[PDB]
């Protein structure tokens, strides 16, 4: 209920939310349906337009009017935002040349650069080169101030969860947005576009930007617009209150447009259509500029332009069908489109089988324009499994492509051209990101970065504290001329053992044999030297990773490797190695085919063993590093280390030895060398952060060696190529992966094929960030570089994506 028969008089877009059933006049009201009776007249006005002209300048104030020309608006902040303009002979901002904001040119009683976050639904990355012509203030934003040639929105690649992303800084799976439409199913509750159960707090998690800056005493707008006002209403009422006193101002504030999406859902991505939607946009973009300049507070705000996702080409005709696939299509609920979400239809029906389903769904037409996965075999780069409202079937969808229960679907539910949603990665899903203000920097270009980053920047520019999130603060501190946050690395937690030779042979009963006892003072000396960390230098490039957890390990040094062994994982943490462009790739030696040689530094009882495997039908071994890039025969014996042993179903052993022993090389030849650390993953709980020994489901039989969910490697290099990646001067290049530890192939439909036809192209849908894997392993990386921290913490958010250009 609503009591509507109050009155918006002097409380038109009022900053507090007033309890019901007391009628509001604040921006969201429309849509609550609950404004007061007279919202429309008093706060909603349009008589004459949005524009001054000649004959209106100095005009009689009249306060019907949408806003207004006379002497006094200035002082009312309530001019037309081209006033100035037309009747004081000033220019358009976009038409002043740029000039530097060295300093913040504030008005008296301003405490602080306010921040106004700008936010367009639907900018496909491509429009700031592509409509660059039709968009002038967009384009002098974007040139004269900060600007990524693409952001990189959150998976699903949906409007809410991006735009709760942006405004908290977390993964939908944190923050709980991780639909548009969702189900829970502890509140047995549904989340719809269209109702009122999306406006419970309930669904909400984390702490959006509004709240952290209220919390620390900044004052926000309200940031959610009614569909219904006008966007030259929005810009006015944000100038108004940019008007207000001290005391009652807000320092951020946020504008939404709900264009260019909504029209390239219906003409395409590049419709001749888009070109009027990019136009109009930039006028509010204009509008936005000149009503600043106005106030005196063009070179005083901070302002963000940031886009929420892009758009792809998806017509009617590329939908797949599950009842194509399933025989019990009627047994199953799927949330359909640009992704697949699949759960029973009831509860109640102990027929249906999870299992049935996917292997149902798996490879079974040839050019099949989706993939499914239990969501725990995402890519760990999408982040999209912790949280009870994401379904234990996912369906990730070709670009260009839809998925639909039953045809009855698409027409009795082409009426669109364009969607979104897609894998993160995908070009046509990148937005935009522009910084313009004293803060950002002037006319400076910033590598593409991920839109989970900019919580924290917000915070920064305005003196807040981030609550917890996702985002690595310093990472974006190469966007600011000032308020960088200057973090400082995290602690050791464990520090290593460094073992000597302790063990005799005959002490272990592994069940491990090699042919290895055939045999100086030359090299006798030489390899207690390699023992000891002689060749440490060459394969530990950037420090030793830091443990930040509680853990006993050892430091263990060979000729072409050094590892951090866990006495409690019974396998290495990682394992470090260089190869320099020239290295040669060898074979494994007949008579070392199952080699396996106790590591008399290591006691028998932190050992694997060799029993374990042989007995365990499922479950065989590989090795870290790899015997295949041994510097000489001699060296590789080291490889055959029960110490750089690690478990390895059949399936997985196909594509780790492809990696090992034809894909290193050749990124050492492309790159002039590389540095690899690779190591395990435990990740049981699909919560992206390293289990505790506890938290372990699977062993190899009969033992206490756990088995990995993942295979991670971080491979570095010199920026400048020109510099092997063992002698680098300045900025480091990374790639890194965390791959699926899985017993079959069923991911990738041309397993049957060569690794040459499949391999890399598992390893790509795979690309992580070095982060990430920090996450899952609980190690600090690149400890000991020249490099300046902020500038590692950007390296360690990269992601290869092996994308085309934009
Ligand atoms: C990305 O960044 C985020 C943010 O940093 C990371 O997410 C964090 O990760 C932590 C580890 O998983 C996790 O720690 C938990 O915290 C549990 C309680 O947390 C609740 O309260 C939070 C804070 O309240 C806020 O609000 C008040 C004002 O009202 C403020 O003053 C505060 O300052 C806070 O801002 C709250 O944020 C959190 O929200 C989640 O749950 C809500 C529903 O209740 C959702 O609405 C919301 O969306 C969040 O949901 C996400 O996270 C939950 C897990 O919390 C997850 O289930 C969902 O799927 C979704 O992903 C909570 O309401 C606390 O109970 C935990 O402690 C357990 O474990 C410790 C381990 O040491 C044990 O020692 C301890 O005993 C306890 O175990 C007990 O319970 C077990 C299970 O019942 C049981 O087995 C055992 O026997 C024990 O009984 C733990 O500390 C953070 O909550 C989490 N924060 C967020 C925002 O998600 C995330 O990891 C990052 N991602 C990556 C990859 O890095
Ligand atoms: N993707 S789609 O199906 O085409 C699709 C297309 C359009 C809509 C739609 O009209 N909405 C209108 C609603 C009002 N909103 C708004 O004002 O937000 C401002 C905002 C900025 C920032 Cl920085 C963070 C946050 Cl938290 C919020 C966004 C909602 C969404 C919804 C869905
Ligand atoms: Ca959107
Ligand atoms: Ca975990
Ligand atoms: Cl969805
Ligand atoms: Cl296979
Ligand atoms: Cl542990
Ligand atoms: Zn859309």
Request: with cysteine; aromatic share 12%; charged share 25%.
């Amino acid at each position: 209920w609503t009591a509507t028969s109050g009155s918006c008089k002097g409380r038109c877009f009022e900053l507090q939310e007033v309890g019901p059933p007391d009628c509001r006049c604040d921006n969201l009201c429309k849509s609550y349906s609950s404004c007061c009776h007279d919202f429309d007249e008093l706060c909603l006005k349009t008589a004459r337009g949005w524009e001054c002209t000649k004959d209106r300048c100095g005009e009689v104030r009249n306060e019907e009017n949408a806003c207004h020309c006379s002497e006094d608006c200035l002082s009312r902040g309530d001019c037309c935002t081209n006033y100035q303009v037309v009747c004081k002979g000033e220019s358009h901002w976009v038409d002043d040349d740029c000039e530097e904001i060295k300093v913040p040119e504030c008005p008296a009683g301003f405490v602080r650069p306010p921040l106004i976050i700008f936010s367009v639904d639907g900018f496909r990355a491509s429009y700031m080169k592509k409509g660059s012509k039709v968009m002038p203030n967009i384009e002098k934003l974007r040139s004269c101030g900060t600007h990524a040639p693409y952001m990189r929105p959150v998976y699903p690649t949906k409007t809410f969860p991006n735009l709760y992303t942006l405004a908290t800084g977390l993964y939908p799976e944190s923050h709980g947005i991780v639909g548009n439409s969702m189900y829970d199913p502890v509140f047995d509750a549904s989340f719809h576009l269209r109702g009122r159960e999306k406006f419970n707090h309930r669904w909400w998690g984390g702490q959006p930007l509004w709240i952290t800056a209220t919390k620390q005493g900044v004052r926000a707008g309200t940031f959610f617009w009614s569909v219904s006002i006008p966007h030259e209403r929005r810009i006015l009422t944000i100038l108004q209150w940019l008007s207000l006193p001290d005391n009652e101002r807000p320092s951020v504030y946020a504008f939404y447009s709900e264009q260019p999406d909504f029209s390239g859902h219906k003409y395409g991505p590049f419709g001749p259509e888009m070109t009027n939607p990019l136009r109009e946009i930039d006028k509010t973009v204009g509008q936005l500029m000149d009503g600043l300049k106005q106030l005196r507070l063009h070179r005083c705000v901070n302002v963000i332009f940031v886009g929420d996702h892009g758009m792809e080409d998806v017509t009617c005709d590329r939908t797949e069908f599950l009842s194509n696939y399933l025989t019990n299509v009627d047994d199953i609920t799927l949330v359909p489109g640009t992704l697949g979400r699949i759960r029973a239809k009831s509860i109640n029906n102990s027929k249906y089988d999870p299992k049935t389903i996917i292997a149902a769904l798996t490879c079974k037409k040839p050019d099949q324009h989706f993939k499914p996965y239990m969501k725990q075999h995402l890519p760990k780069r999408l982040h999209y499994a912790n949280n009870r409202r994401i379904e234990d079937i996912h369906l990730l969808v070709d670009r260009r492509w839809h998925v639909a229960r039953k045809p009855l679907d698409v027409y009795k539910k082409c009426f669109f051209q364009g969607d979104h949603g897609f894998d993160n990665k995908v070009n046509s899903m990148q937005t935009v990101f522009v910084g313009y203000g004293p803060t950002f920097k002037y006319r400076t270009k910033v590598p593409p970065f991920e839109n989970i980053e900019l919580y924290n920047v917000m915070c920064d520019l305005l003196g807040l504290k981030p609550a917890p999130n996702n985002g690595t603060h310093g990472s974006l501190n190469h966007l600011l001329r000032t308020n960088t946050f200057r973090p400082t690395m995290p602690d050791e937690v464990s520090r290593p053992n460094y073992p000597g030779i302790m063990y005799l042979q005959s002490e272990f009963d592994l069940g491990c044999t090699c042919d290895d006892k055939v045999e100086n003072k030359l090299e006798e000396l030489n390899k207690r030297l390699h023992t000891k960390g002689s060749t440490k230098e060459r394969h530990l490039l950037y420090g030793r990773p830091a443990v930040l957890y509680r853990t006993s390990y050892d430091i263990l040094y060979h000729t072409d490797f050094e590892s951090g062994y866990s006495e409690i994982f019974l396998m290495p943490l990682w394992t470090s190695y260089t190869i320099s462009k020239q290295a040669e790739v060898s074979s494994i030696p007949e008579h070392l085919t199952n080699c396996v040689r106790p590591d008399v530094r290591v006691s028998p009882g932190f050992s694997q063993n060799c029993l374990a495997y042989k007995n365990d039908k499922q479950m065989s071994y590989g090795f870290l590093f790899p015997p295949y890039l041994s510097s000489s025969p001699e060296a590789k014996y080291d490889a055959f280390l029960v110490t750089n042993m690690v478990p390895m179903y059949p399936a997985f052993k196909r594509v780790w030895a492809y990696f090992q022993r034809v894909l290193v090389k050749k990124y050492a030849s492309e790159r002039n060398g590389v540095n690899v650390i690779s190591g395990p993953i435990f990740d049981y709980n699909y919560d992206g952060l390293r289990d505790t020994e506890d938290e372990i489901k699977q062993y190899v039989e009969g033992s206490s060696i756990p088995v990995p969910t993942h295979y991670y490697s971080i491979i570095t290099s010199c920026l400048d190529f020109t510099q092997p990646a063992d002698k680098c001067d300045g900025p480091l290049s990374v790639s890194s992966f965390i791959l699926p530890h899985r017993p079959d192939n069923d991911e990738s439909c041309n397993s049957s094929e060569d690794e040459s036809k499949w391999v890399e192209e598992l390893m790509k849908m795979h690309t992580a960030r070095v982060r990430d894997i920090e996450h899952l392993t609980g190690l600090d990386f690149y400890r000991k570089t020249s490099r300046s921290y902020s500038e590692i913490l950007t390296l360690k958010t990269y992601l290869h994506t092996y994308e085309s250009e934009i």
